[PDB]
Fold DUF3237 protein.
Amino acid sequence: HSSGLVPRGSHMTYLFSATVNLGGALAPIPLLGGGTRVVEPITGGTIYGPGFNATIEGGLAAPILIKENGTTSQLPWVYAYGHASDGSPFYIEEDGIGSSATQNTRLIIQVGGKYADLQKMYVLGQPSVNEERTVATVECWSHHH
């Protein structure tokens, strides 16, 4: 308990993990400047945790791979949709650009219903992928704006 009406101090709060099934990737597309766009359709998946539970029904991952100063970066653009456990439709977008001297990128979650308050949060996601490129995983927490 603090004096005043707003508690201060860092509070990062775990929200959920997303398991994303990938199916049918396209061959890399060569971009002006030397990068590549890799299109990976999403065939399904699930989201589970204290802050969000949902079934993924579709979308796509569209990472860009770009070599700069010898190192290859991935801009992990993802667009996905489905229904939350209360039946509410949702749309999720993972930003490819994660500037904040941090590796993670912002996930924006747009959903009504029981999980609507996710729209008010600043959500950061950590994506990873298995070597068969069949399943991607994202782990998401809220941060202070």
Q: What stands out?
A: The chain is about 0% helix and 55% strand.
